[PDB]
Amino acid sequence: DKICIGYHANNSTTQVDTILEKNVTVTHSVELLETQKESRFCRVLNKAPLDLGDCTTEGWILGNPRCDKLLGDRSWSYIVERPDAQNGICYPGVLKEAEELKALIGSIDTIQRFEMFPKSTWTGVDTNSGVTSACTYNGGSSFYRNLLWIIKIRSDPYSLIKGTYTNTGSQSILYFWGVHHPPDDVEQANLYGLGTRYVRMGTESMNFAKGPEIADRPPANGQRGRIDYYWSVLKPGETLNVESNGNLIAPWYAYKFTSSRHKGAIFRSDLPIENCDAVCQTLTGAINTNKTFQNVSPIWIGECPKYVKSKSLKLATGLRNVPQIAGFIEGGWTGMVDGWYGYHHENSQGSGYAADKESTQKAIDGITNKVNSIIDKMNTQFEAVEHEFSNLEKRISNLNKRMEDGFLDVWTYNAELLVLLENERTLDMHDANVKNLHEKVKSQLRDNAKDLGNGCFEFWHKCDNECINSVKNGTYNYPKYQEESRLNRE
Amino acid sequence: DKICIGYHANNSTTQVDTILEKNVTVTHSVELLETQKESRFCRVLNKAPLDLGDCTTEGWILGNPRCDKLLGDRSWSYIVERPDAQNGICYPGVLKEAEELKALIGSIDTIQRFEMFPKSTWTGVDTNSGVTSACTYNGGSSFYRNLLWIIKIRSDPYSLIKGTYTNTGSQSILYFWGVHHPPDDVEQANLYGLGTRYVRMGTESMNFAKGPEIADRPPANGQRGRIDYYWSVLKPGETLNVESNGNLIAPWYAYKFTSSRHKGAIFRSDLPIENCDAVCQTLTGAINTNKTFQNVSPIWIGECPKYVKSKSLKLATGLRNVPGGWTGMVDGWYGYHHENSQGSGYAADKESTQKAIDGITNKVNSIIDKMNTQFEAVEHEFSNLEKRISNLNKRMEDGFLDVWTYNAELLVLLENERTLDMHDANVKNLHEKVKSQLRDNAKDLGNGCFEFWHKCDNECINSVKNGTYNYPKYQEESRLNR
Amino acid sequence: DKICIGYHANNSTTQVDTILEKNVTVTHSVELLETQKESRFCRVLNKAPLDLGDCTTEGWILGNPRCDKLLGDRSWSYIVERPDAQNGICYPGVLKEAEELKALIGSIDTIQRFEMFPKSTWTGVDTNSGVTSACTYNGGSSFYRNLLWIIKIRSDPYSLIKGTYTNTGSQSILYFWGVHHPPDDVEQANLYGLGTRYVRMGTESMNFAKGPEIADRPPANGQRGRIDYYWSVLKPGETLNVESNGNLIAPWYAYKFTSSRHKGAIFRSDLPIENCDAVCQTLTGAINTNKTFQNVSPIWIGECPKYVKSKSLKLATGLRNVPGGWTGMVDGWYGYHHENSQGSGYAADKESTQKAIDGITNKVNSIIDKMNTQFEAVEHEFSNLEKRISNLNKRMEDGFLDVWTYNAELLVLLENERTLDMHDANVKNLHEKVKSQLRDNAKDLGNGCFEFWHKCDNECINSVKNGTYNYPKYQEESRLN
Numbered sequence A: 001d002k003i004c005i006g007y008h009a010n011n012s013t014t015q016v017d018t019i020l021e022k023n024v025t026v027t028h029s030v031e032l033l034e035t036q037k038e039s040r041f042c043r044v045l046n047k048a049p050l051d052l053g054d055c056t057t058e059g060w061i062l063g064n065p066r067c068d069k070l071l072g073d074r075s076w077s078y079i080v081e082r083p084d085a086q087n088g089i090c091y092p093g094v095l096k097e098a099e100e101l102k103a104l105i106g107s108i109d110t111i112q113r114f115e116m117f118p119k120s121t122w123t124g125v126d127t128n129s130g131v132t133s134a135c136t137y138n139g140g141s142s143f144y145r146n147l148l149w150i151i152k153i154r155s156d157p158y159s160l161i162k163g164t165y166t167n168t169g170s171q172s173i174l175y176f177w178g179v180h181h182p183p184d185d186v187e188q189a190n191l192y193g194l195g196t197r198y199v200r201m202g203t204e205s206m207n208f209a210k211g212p213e214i215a216d217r218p219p220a221n222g223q224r225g226r227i228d229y230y231w232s233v234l235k236p237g238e239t240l241n242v243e244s245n246g247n248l249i250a251p252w253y254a255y256k257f258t259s260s261r262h263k264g265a266i267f268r269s270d271l272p273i274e275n276c277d278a279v280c281q282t283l284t285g286a287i288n289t290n291k292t293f294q295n296v297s298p299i300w301i302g303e304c305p306k307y308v309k310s311k312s313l314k315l316a317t318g319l320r321n322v323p324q325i326a327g328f329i330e331g332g333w334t335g336m337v338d339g340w341y342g343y344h345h346e347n348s349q350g351s352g353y354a355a356d357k358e359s360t361q362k363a364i365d366g367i368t369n370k371v372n373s374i375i376d377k378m379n380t381q382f383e384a385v386e387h388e389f390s391n392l393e394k395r396i397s398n399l400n401k402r403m404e405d406g407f408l409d410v411w412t413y414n415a416e417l418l419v420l421l422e423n424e425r426t427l428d429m430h431d432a433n434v435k436n437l438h439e440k441v442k443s444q445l446r447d448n449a450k451d452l453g454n455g456c457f458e459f460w461h462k463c464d465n466e467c468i469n470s471v472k473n474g475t476y477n478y479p480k481y482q483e484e485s486r487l488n489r490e
Numbered sequence B: 001d002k003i004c005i006g007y008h009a010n011n012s013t014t015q016v017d018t019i020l021e022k023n024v025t026v027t028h029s030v031e032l033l034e035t036q037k038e039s040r041f042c043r044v045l046n047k048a049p050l051d052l053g054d055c056t057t058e059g060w061i062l063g064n065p066r067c068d069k070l071l072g073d074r075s076w077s078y079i080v081e082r083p084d085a086q087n088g089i090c091y092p093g094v095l096k097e098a099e100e101l102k103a104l105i106g107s108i109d110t111i112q113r114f115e116m117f118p119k120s121t122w123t124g125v126d127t128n129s130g131v132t133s134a135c136t137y138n139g140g141s142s143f144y145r146n147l148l149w150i151i152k153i154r155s156d157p158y159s160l161i162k163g164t165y166t167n168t169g170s171q172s173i174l175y176f177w178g179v180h181h182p183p184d185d186v187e188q189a190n191l192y193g194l195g196t197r198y199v200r201m202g203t204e205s206m207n208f209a210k211g212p213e214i215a216d217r218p219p220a221n222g223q224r225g226r227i228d229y230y231w232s233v234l235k236p237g238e239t240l241n242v243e244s245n246g247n248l249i250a251p252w253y254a255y256k257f258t259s260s261r262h263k264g265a266i267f268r269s270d271l272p273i274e275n276c277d278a279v280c281q282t283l284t285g286a287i288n289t290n291k292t293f294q295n296v297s298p299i300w301i302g303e304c305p306k307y308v309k310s311k312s313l314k315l316a317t318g319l320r321n322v323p324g325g326w327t328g329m330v331d332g333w334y335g336y337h338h339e340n341s342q343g344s345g346y347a348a349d350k351e352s353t354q355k356a357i358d359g360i361t362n363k364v365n366s367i368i369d370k371m372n373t374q375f376e377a378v379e380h381e382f383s384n385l386e387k388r389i390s391n392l393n394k395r396m397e398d399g400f401l402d403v404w405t406y407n408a409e410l411l412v413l414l415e416n417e418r419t420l421d422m423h424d425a426n427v428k429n430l431h432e433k434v435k436s437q438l439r440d441n442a443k444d445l446g447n448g449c450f451e452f453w454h455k456c457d458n459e460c461i462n463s464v465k466n467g468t469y470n471y472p473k474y475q476e477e478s479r480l481n482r
Numbered sequence C: 001d002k003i004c005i006g007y008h009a010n011n012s013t014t015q016v017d018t019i020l021e022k023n024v025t026v027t028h029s030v031e032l033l034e035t036q037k038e039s040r041f042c043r044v045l046n047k048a049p050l051d052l053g054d055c056t057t058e059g060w061i062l063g064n065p066r067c068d069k070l071l072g073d074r075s076w077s078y079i080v081e082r083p084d085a086q087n088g089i090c091y092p093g094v095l096k097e098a099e100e101l102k103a104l105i106g107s108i109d110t111i112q113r114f115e116m117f118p119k120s121t122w123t124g125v126d127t128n129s130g131v132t133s134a135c136t137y138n139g140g141s142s143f144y145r146n147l148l149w150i151i152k153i154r155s156d157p158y159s160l161i162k163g164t165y166t167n168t169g170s171q172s173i174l175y176f177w178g179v180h181h182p183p184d185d186v187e188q189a190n191l192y193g194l195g196t197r198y199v200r201m202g203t204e205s206m207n208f209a210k211g212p213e214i215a216d217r218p219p220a221n222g223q224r225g226r227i228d229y230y231w232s233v234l235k236p237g238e239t240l241n242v243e244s245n246g247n248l249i250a251p252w253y254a255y256k257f258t259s260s261r262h263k264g265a266i267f268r269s270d271l272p273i274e275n276c277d278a279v280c281q282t283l284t285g286a287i288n289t290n291k292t293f294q295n296v297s298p299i300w301i302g303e304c305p306k307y308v309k310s311k312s313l314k315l316a317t318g319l320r321n322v323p324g325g326w327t328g329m330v331d332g333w334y335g336y337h338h339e340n341s342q343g344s345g346y347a348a349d350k351e352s353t354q355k356a357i358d359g360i361t362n363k364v365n366s367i368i369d370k371m372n373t374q375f376e377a378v379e380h381e382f383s384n385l386e387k388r389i390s391n392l393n394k395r396m397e398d399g400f401l402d403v404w405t406y407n408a409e410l411l412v413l414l415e416n417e418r419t420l421d422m423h424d425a426n427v428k429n430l431h432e433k434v435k436s437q438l439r440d441n442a443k444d445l446g447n448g449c450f451e452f453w454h455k456c457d458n459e460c461i462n463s464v465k466n467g468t469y470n471y472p473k474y475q476e477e478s479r480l481n
């Protein structure tokens, strides 16, 4: 006649690691790391990304005429720029503060294009010949649709020209202009005239006065001339004045815009945009998951889990899985099934397995709480950003990089280390819970049963089902069987 | 006759959390997080902050004439700017590198104002008409007290003008100038003259050369003109040369300054400045605490505890409070209750109580020790063309805050669970030390107590406590009773 | 007749700390922190650093004529600038974007100097009088070897001058120029001429047009004039055009360069450069170690361990050393001491000793594995107008340092306590395996040993060790006693 203390086992082959031991098979586990993504770009909070097609952010916003598919009012949750986009700044030159412009654009929600300065604002000049082979449209010469390249009428001098616009709305306005620099004085004379020339732009809060910076330079996109492109934001209430007597690339169309209530982004990617929705949209695809870590990409919008370098974060929730009557010391019981820890008895009324409800449940609750506590404490994300840096910003670019890789290494370490350490605790907690049941039984039976050093106890007497249950509920009664016992123990 | 092993309990209702379970009542705990502050600004290392009143940092340092209350020599542990301050850059324009100037000013300790270039320096020009309705003083037109707005005499051309100053002291000098930009060529001709005009400033180590950038603009503060304001530091030994034939807003008064040996700050706040002292002064008030974390503010000067987002960090120092436990023990944490013919009573086990007290006190102090650093967020400012480094700074500051908060919260949960396991084990040890000694001269009861099969006097009971029991002496008397 | 359960001890005096107690002596420990360095500069991936001697990075790269020891093709894994170097920008003025130039230079691995614009490119001007007392060479007046200071011939006007160069290679080219600003109109007229003057430089991707900004300024290095120095990179394929009628300090020699596949650095240090190799080279010396943390310096190139502020990170790998414990055990960590009529002796329990050795070894390696990453501080420079990003960089670097230090110190304290608890438990297990087997055929003694109520031969004692004891066989003989 006997009773054993033992623990659950099953067919699982899932392994976890601990600080002490690797490749340890367990009965139950939860993987905390999401590794799967849909390789595409989806809507976020029901708002679609803007596909720039064969255009760059600059070609788009300056209105390169090969970018007409994007022309006009648009709204977007994020921007998708194709890596090999060919249509950008077609007439050669520099966009001043280009990287800050992109940051601005990435924080914008919606834009509304409108005519800020119609051609009629500039009088005594040629508003219809401002085109170049560098900016083609259907093979012929053309120009940015948001800028107007004014030149003199052949017969007349380039008169002083003036224009004003007042932002009377509540939305800020993003607008552009340029100064054209011919490669020599002959072209300068032809297009604008000799003498001092200036482009002046004035606001309540910005002031601008510049002239041609003539110089012979090698051709870029077929052109020896250049344009310095500038951008600015006319704030609500502000008024802009424009004066020039030459070399002005005037603002034509501009954008009333709103600033997103959400984090946005410009993704440089070739992934397709499809008709789908995503809670979490990363640079390298959409994630749909309840998990709390993620090794897909550090760059995203929406609500994503923390990025880490890990290939897995398998957290043990069950016991060491070790199958082979006999109790816990020789392994686990595939036959238990009921629960995690329990008993196996054998008397004249048969035999069988039964879990200890109370200790199984107390352990389930502690583990469930542990998991939720981990989920809770990992419920923040460091958010890397794809801002851009010029060739003269190596230092802050490197600063940003070291910072982003810094937090990635700390969080990866934190996550990996936590899983290793708590797994060891989880498995020790099992060993102890089993020990507790075994010891609750041992203390009760004293010398009315033999230990066997094995997890089971052999009764020195008869133990019916009502006796065996009296051991489970912890109300055994040593004296009743003490005499019967001692006679067989001697 | 009997002896029991048990543990302490009391009237405490304080709860802590562990990784395994929540809302666990304990006998003793220490709260590690400071959440209280005095909503005011105090002295730090016995030096008072500077209240800028109705002035902004810029109005102050350029000497806006409505800011005369701040004019002259000053010194401070930190600066308090009022959010709604109205007197700043009164004549419209831009202070170049304004944000870097503020960082500088925040690292300054004391300033001494002095006349760098008196009016007599500039000859053949009008040094007495340089005033505007935009910078008013008692209703009349005026101008910044640290700058001089020079224009031509009506009859004469604006002559080339020159001035030099040499810093012969050991203190650096902070000084200001500007270039005035009229809105059109007519005003330009009136005030300075036509042709190329320049403002040139030179030093052993810096140079500067700029002209008017004339342009039609809308009025701001009633004026279509603008001034680009500039600042710089003339180092000890250096000499400054100034040369212009127009558009120069010349330096007039400047500041010899010293750099603080301590971290300083500019707080934008409406909190009152009072006659008090603070070891730790945050943007949102003063903290006086021995605690090691703090959820008041990430921005401070003085010696503050680490900022975290947590609402509490309650660390268990005692046992699970379950009255189970013995409210009657009082002596210590773990111990005994005996009963014989000489009475009964409770008594703690000194040695195991003390060993556990020392381990916990060490744990607390070890935590305090390892958390004895602070990440220090700074209130530097960023222009509208510095969105990227501004965002970089923000993500960094929040980055450390999230790692330290996680570190702190997680540590408390994990070590609380260890603390409470250690109690369970210590109690079990005493019980087992007793059991092994008595063997079958006493009955277990499965209950924590032992019923003696014999008489056990106080001398016997004490022999069990000190671990020198003597089974054979009572073995006969014992075995017969069963 | 008896058997005891006990644990190892030895002569070790090494101490570790735990979260619960301090100065705890243990039998074995591993120090995880490297504190030793060779105070010198070594080769890294077989390439030597470049010693700038008495020259600054700027004097070197502009070709200050007192820096001829460096002149020409060079290559390096890192640059060592001496703190007290005196030869830099000798004619007074400002190198634009100097700090970015240094970052560039730190990322370069080899340069090849060549004549970009020979003197013959500039016609109708004086290409042979461009010298100053501020830039001396053997006592006489001279000038940077990579720049040409052109002035007018006395009799003639300064003609418009032109030059072009096209980068037809695959390597980028680093080059320099300047604009000279005289201190007054008389010197201006003398050297270049009156009227508007300009210096124009053009490329497919950069445009430059500036004039003299004449002003009297106090003398620096004996000179009231100034030069604004500029630098740029002509990319492969690009072509540079130069046009001026005055005030041009022309490019003369420039550098084709290659970009390092590795992190480089400019170290400001007086440490000697020697014939050695270093896997890890820090600003304050070379480290050769297998350890995983390091308190030598946060600045390095090569493969270094993680920098921390700690003075030590001693991890317990053995037991509490308390000779209590058995100096006589030697075999292993946990075991037995028996005594019968066939003698006495000590013997370790192989299975439980080995399981503990493996768990600890794994713990150490796991720690090593998880700490196998480094935050890398950099010595980029910041101007006096970059206090904010300089402070941002500083707070960031000290931020990670504090987090990693905390992580490392805290981990050692916590795992040391776990390590020492695991020993206490393993010993207790052996003791309780033996107790359950013997029941009342032996006496506990409350002491760790068991006194047998019967005779226990070596075969009996081993039957206890292997866990197959046989209580009934000796139960009668026992009960008699």
Ligand SMILES: *[C@@H]1O[C@H](CO)[C@@H](O[C@@H]2O[C@H](CO)[C@@H](O)[C@H](O)[C@H]2NC(C)=O)[C@H](O)[C@H]1NC(C)=O
Residues within 6 Å of the ligand: A035, A295, A296, A297, A310, A311, A312
């Ligand atoms: C995130 O981790 C997963 C695995 O946990 C990586 O995906 C595996 O990569 C291997 C080796 O290339 C493939 O053969 C397996 O098919 C992948 N496993 C799964 C489940 O997809 C993945 O590369 C990691 N992500 C990133 C961006 O590095």
Ligand SMILES: *[C@@H]1O[C@H](CO)[C@@H](O)[C@H](O)[C@H]1NC(C)=O
Residues within 6 Å of the ligand: B022, B023
């Ligand atoms: C713990 O107690 C608080 C009240 O202090 C209560 O709001 C909360 O719901 C409790 N949590 C759990 C898990 O019982």
Ligand SMILES: *[C@@H]1O[C@H](CO)[C@@H](O)[C@H](O)[C@H]1NC(C)=O
Residues within 6 Å of the ligand: B035, B295, B296, B310, B311, B312
């Ligand atoms: C922590 O401080 C916050 C400040 O954000 C305060 O409102 C709150 O009451 C604090 N939490 C607790 C539990 O004191």
Ligand SMILES: *[C@@H]1O[C@H](CO)[C@@H](O)[C@H](O)[C@H]1NC(C)=O
Residues within 6 Å of the ligand: C015, C022, C023
């Ligand atoms: C142990 O602690 C004391 C101070 O409490 C210290 O003086 C002593 O040097 C320490 N020993 C070691 C080996 O660090």
Ligand SMILES: *[C@@H]1O[C@H](CO)[C@@H](O)[C@H](O)[C@H]1NC(C)=O
Residues within 6 Å of the ligand: C035, C295, C296, C310, C311, C312
């Ligand atoms: C590193 O720690 C060691 C002690 O292990 C000490 O001798 C040394 O001062 C430390 N080095 C530095 C640079 O702080």
